[PDB]
Enzyme design. Structure first.
Site, PDB file in Angstrom:
ATOM      1  N   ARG A 115      14.121   7.010  -0.149  1.00  0.00           N
ATOM      2  CA  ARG A 115      14.989   8.002  -0.766  1.00  0.00           C
ATOM      3  C   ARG A 115      16.171   7.412  -1.517  1.00  0.00           C
ATOM      4  NH1 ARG A 115      16.683  11.562   4.058  1.00  0.00           N
ATOM      5  NH2 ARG A 115      15.782  10.014   5.500  1.00  0.00           N
ATOM      6  N   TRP A 284       5.955   4.775  -5.545  1.00  0.00           N
ATOM      7  CA  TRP A 284       5.216   3.525  -5.457  1.00  0.00           C
ATOM      8  C   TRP A 284       5.151   3.091  -3.989  1.00  0.00           C
ATOM      9  CZ3 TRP A 284       9.764   3.790  -8.472  1.00  0.00           C
ATOM     10  CH2 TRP A 284      10.917   3.316  -7.827  1.00  0.00           C
ATOM     11  N   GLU A 289       1.873   0.252   3.983  1.00  0.00           N
ATOM     12  CA  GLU A 289       1.022   1.436   4.008  1.00  0.00           C
ATOM     13  C   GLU A 289      -0.425   1.054   3.766  1.00  0.00           C
ATOM     14  OE1 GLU A 289       2.968   4.980   1.939  1.00  0.00           O
ATOM     15  OE2 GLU A 289       4.140   3.311   1.120  1.00  0.00           O
TER      16      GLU A 289
HETATM   17  C1  HEM Z   1       9.841   6.030  -4.817  1.00  0.00           C
HETATM   18  C2  HEM Z   1       9.097   5.294  -3.987  1.00  0.00           C
HETATM   19  C3  HEM Z   1       8.772   5.852  -2.595  1.00  0.00           C
HETATM   20  C4  HEM Z   1       8.568   5.093  -1.532  1.00  0.00           C
HETATM   21  C5  HEM Z   1       8.654   3.566  -1.533  1.00  0.00           C
HETATM   22  C6  HEM Z   1       8.288   5.958  -0.405  1.00  0.00           C
HETATM   23  C7  HEM Z   1       8.034   5.550   0.886  1.00  0.00           C
HETATM   24  C8  HEM Z   1       7.524   6.385   1.834  1.00  0.00           C
HETATM   25  C9  HEM Z   1       6.770   6.006   2.997  1.00  0.00           C
HETATM   26  C10 HEM Z   1       6.397   4.564   3.410  1.00  0.00           C
HETATM   27  C11 HEM Z   1       6.468   7.126   3.650  1.00  0.00           C
HETATM   28  C12 HEM Z   1       5.645   7.202   4.945  1.00  0.00           C
HETATM   29  C13 HEM Z   1       4.227   7.541   4.500  1.00  0.00           C
HETATM   30  C14 HEM Z   1       3.236   7.337   5.616  1.00  0.00           C
HETATM   31  O1  HEM Z   1       3.362   6.365   6.426  1.00  0.00           O
HETATM   32  O2  HEM Z   1       2.294   8.168   5.668  1.00  0.00           O
HETATM   33  C15 HEM Z   1       7.000   8.258   2.912  1.00  0.00           C
HETATM   34  C16 HEM Z   1       6.921   9.592   3.261  1.00  0.00           C
HETATM   35  C17 HEM Z   1       7.364  10.662   2.517  1.00  0.00           C
HETATM   36  N1  HEM Z   1       7.959  10.597   1.267  1.00  0.00           N
HETATM   37 FE1  HEM Z   1       8.503   8.864   0.332  1.00  0.00          FE
HETATM   38  N2  HEM Z   1       8.314   7.270  -0.842  1.00  0.00           N
HETATM   39  C18 HEM Z   1       8.603   7.247  -2.206  1.00  0.00           C
HETATM   40  C19 HEM Z   1       8.698   8.346  -3.037  1.00  0.00           C
HETATM   41  C20 HEM Z   1       8.771   9.662  -2.675  1.00  0.00           C
HETATM   42  C21 HEM Z   1       8.972  10.789  -3.576  1.00  0.00           C
HETATM   43  C22 HEM Z   1       9.098  10.659  -5.122  1.00  0.00           C
HETATM   44  C23 HEM Z   1       8.980  11.891  -2.804  1.00  0.00           C
HETATM   45  C24 HEM Z   1       9.173  13.358  -3.172  1.00  0.00           C
HETATM   46  C25 HEM Z   1       9.560  13.717  -4.395  1.00  0.00           C
HETATM   47  C26 HEM Z   1       8.789  11.492  -1.421  1.00  0.00           C
HETATM   48  C27 HEM Z   1       8.757  12.322  -0.313  1.00  0.00           C
HETATM   49  C28 HEM Z   1       8.221  11.914   0.891  1.00  0.00           C
HETATM   50  C29 HEM Z   1       7.801  12.806   1.952  1.00  0.00           C
HETATM   51  C30 HEM Z   1       7.925  14.347   1.964  1.00  0.00           C
HETATM   52  C31 HEM Z   1       7.295  12.059   2.922  1.00  0.00           C
HETATM   53  C32 HEM Z   1       6.745  12.617   4.245  1.00  0.00           C
HETATM   54  C33 HEM Z   1       5.223  12.534   4.161  1.00  0.00           C
HETATM   55  C34 HEM Z   1       4.624  13.356   5.256  1.00  0.00           C
HETATM   56  O3  HEM Z   1       5.407  14.008   6.007  1.00  0.00           O
HETATM   57  O4  HEM Z   1       3.370  13.330   5.363  1.00  0.00           O
HETATM   58  N3  HEM Z   1       8.652  10.125  -1.393  1.00  0.00           N
HETATM   59  N4  HEM Z   1       7.656   7.753   1.813  1.00  0.00           N
HETATM   60  C1  LIG Z   2       5.316   9.752  -2.587  1.00  0.00           C
HETATM   61  C2  LIG Z   2       4.789   8.723  -1.628  1.00  0.00           C
HETATM   62  C3  LIG Z   2       5.256   7.422  -1.670  1.00  0.00           C
HETATM   63  C4  LIG Z   2       4.762   6.491  -0.761  1.00  0.00           C
HETATM   64  N1  LIG Z   2       5.176   5.200  -0.759  1.00  0.00           N
HETATM   65  N2  LIG Z   2       3.848   6.870   0.141  1.00  0.00           N
HETATM   66  C5  LIG Z   2       3.374   8.126   0.212  1.00  0.00           C
HETATM   67  C6  LIG Z   2       2.322   8.465   1.253  1.00  0.00           C
HETATM   68  C7  LIG Z   2       1.014   8.623   0.494  1.00  0.00           C
HETATM   69  C8  LIG Z   2      -0.255   8.451   1.301  1.00  0.00           C
HETATM   70  C9  LIG Z   2      -0.327   8.641   2.683  1.00  0.00           C
HETATM   71  C10 LIG Z   2      -1.551   8.456   3.339  1.00  0.00           C
HETATM   72  C11 LIG Z   2      -1.699   8.640   4.835  1.00  0.00           C
HETATM   73  C12 LIG Z   2      -0.798   9.776   5.308  1.00  0.00           C
HETATM   74  N3  LIG Z   2      -1.428  10.642   6.331  1.00  0.00           N
HETATM   75  C13 LIG Z   2      -2.422   9.937   7.154  1.00  0.00           C
HETATM   76  C14 LIG Z   2      -3.081  10.938   8.099  1.00  0.00           C
HETATM   77  N4  LIG Z   2      -2.058  11.577   8.945  1.00  0.00           N
HETATM   78  C15 LIG Z   2      -2.691  12.581   9.814  1.00  0.00           C
HETATM   79  C16 LIG Z   2      -1.057  12.256   8.113  1.00  0.00           C
HETATM   80  C17 LIG Z   2      -0.394  11.232   7.201  1.00  0.00           C
HETATM   81  C18 LIG Z   2      -2.684   8.098   2.613  1.00  0.00           C
HETATM   82  C19 LIG Z   2      -2.612   7.926   1.233  1.00  0.00           C
HETATM   83  F1  LIG Z   2      -3.706   7.581   0.519  1.00  0.00           F
HETATM   84  C20 LIG Z   2      -1.398   8.105   0.591  1.00  0.00           C
HETATM   85  F2  LIG Z   2      -1.336   7.929  -0.742  1.00  0.00           F
HETATM   86  C21 LIG Z   2       3.835   9.077  -0.687  1.00  0.00           C
END
Ligand code: HEM
Ligand SMILES: Cc1cc(N)nc(CCc2cc(CCN3CCN(C)CC3)cc(F)c2F)c1
Ligand code: HEM
Ligand SMILES: Cc1cc(N)nc(CCc2cc(CCN3CCN(C)CC3)cc(F)c2F)c1
Ligand SMILES: C[C@H](O)[C@H](O)[C@H]1CNc2nc(N)[nH]c(=O)c2N1
Ligand SMILES: C[C@H](O)[C@H](O)[C@H]1CNc2nc(N)[nH]c(=O)c2N1
Ligand SMILES: [Zn+2]
Lengths: 414, 411
Positions: A115, A284, A289
């Site tokens: 963020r 990105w 991940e």
């Molecule tokens: C800009 C580069 C970004 C990076 C490096 C990043 C990084 C991450 C990572 C590592 C996660 C955990 C994902 C996982 O383990 O499944 C995550 C979750 C999340 N990101 Fe970011 N993100 C980025 C951009 C964004 C943007 C542009 C948005 C929204 C406009 C966003 C909103 C969220 C949300 C809502 C989650 C929660 C996902 C969920 O609850 O399933 N992210 N992000």
């Molecule tokens: C905006 C943004 C930036 C960033 N760095 N990472 C993400 C997560 C994206 C992403 C997440 C996953 C796994 C997430 N699931 C796994 C199953 N579990 C039950 C619920 C959560 C697979 C993707 F192929 C994938 F693309 C989003």
């Protein structure tokens, strides 16, 4: 009212006042904490009575942000909104309000570690879209814009807000780009096992699967509550990275590759009580991940064994840490590969340090920064990243991204 | 909180139903509005008796004799004793039950599959620091057991009025010392600078190297604390070598066998045992990741990777990660070669999932703190990363308590 958080590595203490503006359930009670539950728990459309308070609250804060609180612009907007709700049972957001709300939902996303980038978000207003074909066009432009030949750019595309719940726009894909997964008669799995159900849906809708380890899934797009429709993303828009290793000449023979653009398309954007059920956003990757979760989770691509083998690791006992040894070299390979191809990526050390800096600045300028520790901490090498030792507070600020049911569980077909 | 609460394992899709949580009582700190799952730490007449009543009920419920024979007369007896002594004294069986269940209810502890195999040393007849030292020395020798470590707890007198607490002032029975250097840096264990300075202020003669074993500083009955040198032959220590890197032994690293927590407070039936040191055996990552690699501790990453000759300029080379793995390989290999009990985080976490399954089946739940249970290295490849956990406080329990030096009115 003045909650303190402490870093146990640096001894820095921070004061949180922003928690007073929180609203929705955490899931926790005084007696039970659910902070590791994945999600605590159709008809869900609000009344006129429910809507104006939410709307007024969001409008009040938008105007507070632009330093116009209490202005005549502010007061006419409140009147315009209240009247529009009263006569049409909903209301429309100005374009300025739409951008502010998207960016603030990102800023408020407690599980997101990247963020620090929240205000540099490109917002594509797609609320004029009416069909699945239109959606496909809007998403392609998003992919092409965000991908940018490897120089990734954050973006969200926002389709029309929910109305009566019966005319929703949905992206049935959970991410715009993911690889198919095909279960075999013998219980084995080809491709990405996470995606077997959705791959089956695609095939049922006419998709002809090439049946490979890295097949890009079609898009499955739903406009205005209608049945969803299939569309191949044009392959030249899907940027992909082949995974090699700076030291192990054999790592390329593992035949691994991944796509460069992570784009979440199954969540729901809430702004001023309005619900945008289709709002794919994209950033990105942090390298862990791909290299820890996608490649190494036992229910995913599960390559630890093979990598370990080629490292000639003693795999007799766990205490040799042959899995830990192999995971580090996989995650070295992934970063080295994206970097070698000038595709934007971030490692877990750089990424977490940036987040601490962000969190500290948010405490200073905004009074807080909700964070979910269980998700912020990266899934390898935890305590050597600065967030591990960082106390965090978790609460729900609106506007917000929210989970929503899987459309195939809710949609009624015709 | 609702009739059930189900938790899911995402790697396996195993689902478990919690009902035990209907028995928690104290604050988690979380509210419906904000959650504190990552914050480190969020009696008189009427106060004391109902806590005793609940525990005795819990005890007699635990032995298929609820509302039964001595139960009411034990309730009578406790009621009677509080009337005259203001407090009351636990029967030997109650003390053993409460201590074993304190371990059981320890949400932050991954080792709890072992909970009921605990050796309880009743030191409630102690009256002096000299006596405390003897009781501790015998604990350390029992628990160490020449390398085949066994878990133990020694319980000193309960609190009575605050003025006469029994305290072990070391946080662990066995820690190395920390010395500030003329040039701002630190020698030894940096976490222990303050305590080392108190001991020196108290007359400890420090040898002033890295791994000097701290003396015991024991406080009995509220009097000023006293120094005691544990007899070296009791302090089992392991020299850390690597199974591949010959140069690793040249790093000069060693660590001790017995983790033994002496600063916490054990609560049974409303009574407060402010001195109750308990000891298990180590999970490898505690030594290798946290003690050796926390920047505010021995901070050896730079050292190791420099001899591993790794690219240390950019973070994305993952040189810290690489060295970290190698270090924890060396710790496990070192303890195992010296046949000292130790467990790696893969075995430990797998053990905790069995325990969780056990607890849900036999008890209806198992309070766990995901934040603490997940190992600080290689998180998602262990099975607890994918395990949902509910957290709630059950009694009896181990609680934190203030550092005695912040609170001690010196004689
Ligand atoms: C800009 C580069 C970004 C990076 C490096 C990043 C990084 C991450 C990572 C590592 C996660 C955990 C994902 C996982 O383990 O499944 C995550 C979750 C999340 N990101 Fe970011 N993100 C980025 C951009 C964004 C943007 C542009 C948005 C929204 C406009 C966003 C909103 C969220 C949300 C809502 C989650 C929660 C996902 C969920 O609850 O399933 N992210 N992000
Ligand atoms: C905006 C943004 C930036 C960033 N760095 N990472 C993400 C997560 C994206 C992403 C997440 C996953 C796994 C997430 N699931 C796994 C199953 N579990 C039950 C619920 C959560 C697979 C993707 F192929 C994938 F693309 C989003
Ligand atoms: C027998 C092998 C045991 C193992 C492998 C084990 C493992 C662990 C680990 C790794 C931690 C985290 C420590 C930290 O990161 O600071 C912990 C915490 C804890 N353990 Fe265990 N443990 C064992 C035995 C015991 C025993 C015998 C007791 C009590 C009688 C106990 C009670 C606790 C408590 C109260 C904590 C909380 C630590 C805190 O709050 O600082 N454990 N355990
Ligand atoms: C019973 C038992 C078994 C087992 N395997 N491990 C332990 C942990 C004990 C232990 C912990 C630490 C440091 C932990 N602190 C750091 C500061 N933070 C604020 C609170 C936690 C150092 C020890 F030297 C030490 F021994 C206990
Ligand atoms: C702030 C954060 O809660 C703190 O650093 C915690 C994180 N999780 C932990 N987990 C364990 N096992 N031990 C710890 O000391 C900590 N520290
Ligand atoms: C049950 C547990 O909350 C679950 O495995 C969570 C843990 N932390 C996570 N953290 C991130 N960043 N991503 C995840 O998918 C998860 N999964
Ligand atoms: Zn909570």
């Amino acid at each position: 009212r003045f909650l303190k958080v402490k870093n146990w590595e640096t001894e820095v203490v921070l004061t949180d006042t922003l928690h007073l503006k929180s609203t929705l359930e955490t899931g926790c009670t005084e007696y039970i904490c659910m902070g590791s539950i994945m999600h605590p728990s159709p008809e869900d459309v609000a009344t006129k009575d429910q809507l104006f308070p939410l709307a007024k609250e969001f409008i009040d804060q938008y105007y507070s942000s632009i330093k116009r609180f209490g202005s005549k612009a502010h007061m006419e907007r409140l009147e315009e909104v209240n009247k529009e709700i009263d006569t049409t049972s909903t209301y429309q957001l100005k374009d300025t309000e739409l951008i502010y709300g998207a960016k603030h939902a990102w800023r408020n996303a407690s599980r997101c570690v990247g963020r620090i980038q929240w205000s540099k978000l490109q917002v594509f207003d797609a609320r004029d879209c009416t069909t699945a074909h239109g959606m496909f066009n809007y998403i392609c432009n998003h992919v092409k814009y965000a991908t940018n030949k490897g120089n990734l750019r954050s973006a969200i595309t926002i389709f029309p807000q929910r109305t009566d719940g019966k005319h929703d726009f949905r992206v049935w894909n959970s991410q715009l780009i993911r690889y198919a997964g095909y279960k075999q008669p013998d219980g084995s799995t080809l491709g990405d096992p996470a995606n077997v159900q959705f791959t089956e849906i695609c095939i049922q809708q006419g998709w002809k699967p090439p049946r490979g380890r890295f097949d890009v899934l079609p898009l499955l797009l739903q406009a205005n509550g209608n049945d969803p429709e299939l569309f191949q993303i044009p392959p030249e828009l899907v940027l992909e990275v082949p995974i090699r290793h700076p030291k192990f000449e054999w790592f390329k023979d593992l035949g691994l590759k991944w796509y460069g653009l992570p784009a979440v398309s199954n969540m729901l954007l809430e702004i001023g009580g309005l619900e945008f059920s289709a709002c794919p956003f994209s950033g990105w990757y942090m390298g862990t991940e791909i290299g820890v979760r996608d490649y190494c989770d036992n229910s995913r691509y599960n390559i630890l064994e093979e990598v370990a083998k080629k490292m000639n690791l003693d795999m007799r006992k766990t205490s040799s840490l042959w899995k830990d040894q192999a995971l580090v070299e996989i995650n070295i390979a992934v970063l080295y590969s994206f970097q070698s191809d000038k595709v934007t990526i971030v490692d877990h050390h750089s990424a977490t340090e940036s987040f601490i800096k962000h969190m500290e600045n948010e405490y200073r300028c905004r009074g807080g920064c909700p964070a979910d520790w269980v998700w912020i901490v990266p899934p390898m090498s935890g305590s050597i990243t600065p967030v591990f030792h960082q106390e965090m507070l978790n609460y729900r600020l609106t506007p917000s991204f929210e989970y929503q049911p899987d459309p195939w569980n809710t949609h009624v077909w015709k």
